Design a protein around this ligand. Structure first.
Ligand SMILES: NC[C@H]1O[C@@H](n2c(Br)nc3c(N)ncnc32)[C@H](O)[C@@H]1O
Ligand SMILES: NC[C@H]1O[C@@H](n2c(Br)nc3c(N)ncnc32)[C@H](O)[C@@H]1O
Ligand SMILES: NC[C@H]1O[C@@H](n2c(Br)nc3c(N)ncnc32)[C@H](O)[C@@H]1O
Ligand SMILES: NC[C@H]1O[C@@H](n2c(Br)nc3c(N)ncnc32)[C@H](O)[C@@H]1O
Ligand SMILES: NC[C@H]1O[C@@H](n2c(Br)nc3c(N)ncnc32)[C@H](O)[C@@H]1O
Ligand SMILES: NC[C@H]1O[C@@H](n2c(Br)nc3c(N)ncnc32)[C@H](O)[C@@H]1O
Ligand SMILES: NC[C@H]1O[C@@H](n2c(Br)nc3c(N)ncnc32)[C@H](O)[C@@H]1O
Ligand SMILES: NC[C@H]1O[C@@H](n2c(Br)nc3c(N)ncnc32)[C@H](O)[C@@H]1O
Lengths: 258, 258, 258, 258
């Protein structure tokens, strides 16, 4: 199986990388960063994010592995010490796969993006106001700092800081949270909302048509936007699992105590 | 088809009830409150709740209808004005059915209950402290006023007042929220948590073994409790649908504007 | 100066107590638990609370000292290791005093109480509903689990768990927070409210006239209540200060890191 | 007494303005927008804000009046219908004055600003990280979207949307709230904080030294910032009062029902 490895860039990560590669040379494993079947990232959740988006157009042909050379991550959940064993197990190709849901974002003026964590919307400076439309029915007029639509695995990220709920990744859904909404004229739901597959959430400008849109780490000022559409993606990300590391165990280690 | 009708008890509801019954006598429809196939409640969401628990041991053999003689409800979503048309449409038995997930609560000292909205736990006076265990792994030690586990349709109820998220009822899940947790010694997740089918959440006493437990409207002081177990029920509640009244439309009418 | 000492009841605290007493016998200091001028409590914030209420009718004639034989407290902010030095410094009577504001609670059917932390209101089971009246003007009708009125120093307690703000004790004020308020029929402010001296907040029953009222640690089911009145007390609690332990330093050590 | 009048710019406000001026010509009242003693703004709270900052260097020599030609404001609390009576009462100079506290913001690289509502800090894009220092003691390291320091009267504004408490303007204080703080590495207080006069809160860069700073409506990207200092201003804003419109009455009308 073809494979490739990305590194955070620091000494510890490049060294760990050149080692796994070496240990990989001891097996039938060709290195290939154009058409890999295995993508290993070494660093943190951020390093994993970039690895995802580098190959987001081949998701169905790749199994991702994430190693953390620092504190435990939610995607980088394997310690460096377990590196040599990752190499061997990946060699047999016996491993099982696990898939997490993704979020499709559409922008019309038409652009499409895939989010592993979330996509957010804010104003280009000045007041942020958008009509919120769910499955073609007007739901509310939002006034505040912005909004956030998150994947299940992305709930432990930005979503969490916004009062969103943590959702188990086996649930195919997306969750919308509010940023500093004004409530008085305007009236928002306040609560976070969790949508199932096929539900389409759409945002529409009331005055300003320029928004700062983000998809995971990349953030662009889109001009003359007419509509932003959110829906659970048909596509999924595929991880290779070699042992049991329960999502809630990962939540606990991360937020309660490790 | 056998049927029965419950009423909030006020004049408007008893009159509406005796009318539907009359209009039902114009069809092949036997009234039966022991083995009904159709259960109509007239009043509010509360009147619907009681109707549910009166027949909770026959859920798979009943289709529920809820009429609101006051403000729109989430289960009582049909206006009195549409009564006569309900009667006719129910007569043909052509109607489609829609199912919402329920919550199974287990209490060991062993008692089992079904919740349409939620189940909560509080102390019998004095400090409330419980160990929270998810799928057999200890997740956190909770200290505060109590906890709340909610069904999808129950998210617009108590859950909502506790910062929980609103979840679409087509998602088979349960959501746990915190009540006034202390954070300093103790450390809780803070965020609400959304669990999929088959996940088992368990609460265990640390000192006091007496808790005030609630399942929907009924609330009992259970003594010498050893464990409380929450999991998505295998059983579902079945509604008869005669037209499109989207859950989010029901959320909007209820909280934003009607 | 006459003095007395209370102890949490455990070995460590009784031993520390009998020591300070001994060291006190080395000075002109008569032990007196009826008319003391110095009240030392040994244990935690709870032990301090009880010491306060034991002598709440002599506040202006007493200076309180709080020692923590466990984790740092907000009132028990002196370590056992500093005991012997407390004894000496208290002997000279040179020490300066520091006063924190208190909360006056009034109950009419007429009873008055003093709170060092807060006073809360909940229903005697069944739904809790009260009209909230500020300075004689109706402000809102509250529906939920209950309400909480807190002193400045009490803000780091229950108040904090309810989303209240932490207020510096030199500010003469009281803060009201909500418990799980329903928002839809009913409409509450949501935000916590901070009132200055002389503002009178009053709660009035809408149906049920029985409430579970708490003042700090003591909690009584009051029957046939007609009104509950909150206002900043004219009376203050007096601490003896021997060195600088800034409130915010105490907040930091307690919640961020010690 | 010299006076001047500002208008939102719409027809209704300019007409109301030219009228009051006319009615003012019927008295001994010279119009002067350079050295006025009375400043009347006509529009909304925003129109009042601009009027404040236009003359912020003469606060002690001016009494402000705010008229709302739309929905009730917190500073624009007089209806157009009461215009002619404002004119007469202001003519006698008998009116009483009322003062609200302000917030002093200091920026070092040194710039000083006055806020009627609040001052906020955010990153110039990229992650926002600042050390929070209270009265020279390090309190916490903040990681998130930003922070907000609010005056008492400003609590009903941005502060409110951030979970801050509403504070009565007679209390000389400032309140700090968090924007989407991450909690896991980093650890923040979470709670809002209310500081008394003389307390100095300081923010300091950890990496990036560029921040988007706002003072009320104006928002500037400051570069190479070394410190931002917040403290209750010595200066106060002075309103002319002609009758009783209680702050809490203004809170109620605005958020509960008018
Ligand atoms: N593991 C904690 C660190 O990883 C970043 N992070 C990313 Br990128 N995605 C997530 C994520 N999905 N959950 C938690 N943290 C995440 C998060 O911003 C923090 O810096
Ligand atoms: N920049 C990489 C990641 O940072 C996460 N994030 C952002 Br952006 N802002 C916040 C934030 N304020 N709190 C927690 N996580 C955040 C967000 O999940 C994104 O994928
Ligand atoms: N329709 C609003 C009214 O119905 C009660 N209620 C019940 Br009972 N269940 C729900 C529910 N699931 N969602 C919203 N409100 C509910 C809720 O407590 C309120 O009194
Ligand atoms: N008593 C009937 C219903 O009341 C709902 N409920 C309760 Br109990 N307390 C609250 C509450 N505090 N806020 C909102 N809903 C609530 C809860 O959903 C329950 O099913
Ligand atoms: N010091 C933390 C411990 O002391 C209790 N406590 C009391 Br009693 N009063 C306060 C208080 N005012 N602030 C913080 N904790 C308090 C609080 O409930 C916790 O058990
Ligand atoms: N029982 C002694 C003290 O406990 C505090 N308290 C209570 Br009661 N409930 C909570 C709570 N749920 N969270 C934090 N503090 C609390 C409250 O401040 C009281 O003075
Ligand atoms: N009266 C409500 C309107 O006035 C704006 N506003 C301003 Br500007 N300052 C305040 C303020 N201090 N309180 C409430 N709203 C305010 C607030 O942003 C909203 O647009
Ligand atoms: N722009 C004029 C006023 O708007 C207020 N404000 C801002 Br900026 N953002 C928000 C916001 N997100 N919610 C409520 N008020 C806000 C803030 O109080 C400021 O003085």
């Amino acid at each position: 199986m073809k494979y490739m490895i990305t590194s955070k860039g620091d000494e510890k990560s490049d060294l760990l990388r050149l080692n796994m590669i070496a240990g990989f040379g001891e097996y039938d494993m060709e290195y290939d960063d154009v058409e890999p079947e295995i993508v290993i990232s070494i660093g943190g959740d951020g390093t994993f994010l970039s690895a995802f988006h580098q190959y987001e157009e081949r998701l169905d042909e790749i199994a991702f592995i994430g190693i953390h050379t620092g504190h435990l991550g939610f995607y980088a959940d394997w310690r460096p010490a377990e590196a040599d064993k990752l190499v061997k197990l990946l060699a047999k190709g016996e491993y099982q796969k696990v898939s997490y849901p993704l979020l499709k974002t559409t922008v019309k003026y038409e652009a499409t993006y895939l989010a592993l964590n979330e996509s957010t919307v804010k104003s280009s400076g000045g007041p942020f106001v958008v009509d919120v439309v769910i499955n073609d029915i007007h739901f509310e007029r939002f006034r505040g700092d912005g909004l956030c639509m998150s994947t299940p695995s992305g709930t432990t990220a930005y979503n969490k800081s916004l009062g969103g709920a943590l959702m188990h990744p086996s649930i195919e859904a997306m969750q919308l949270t509010e940023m500093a909404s004004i409530n008085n004229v305007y009236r928002t739901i306040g609560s976070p909302l969790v949508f199932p597959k096929h539900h389409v959430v759409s945002l529409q400008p009331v005055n300003d048509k320029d928004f700062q849109i983000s998809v995971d780490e990349l953030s662009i000022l889109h001009r003359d936007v007419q509509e932003i559409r959110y829906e659970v993606s048909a596509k999924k990300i595929h991880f290779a699992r070699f042992r049991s590391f329960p999502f809630w165990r990962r939540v606990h280690d991360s937020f309660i105590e490790d």
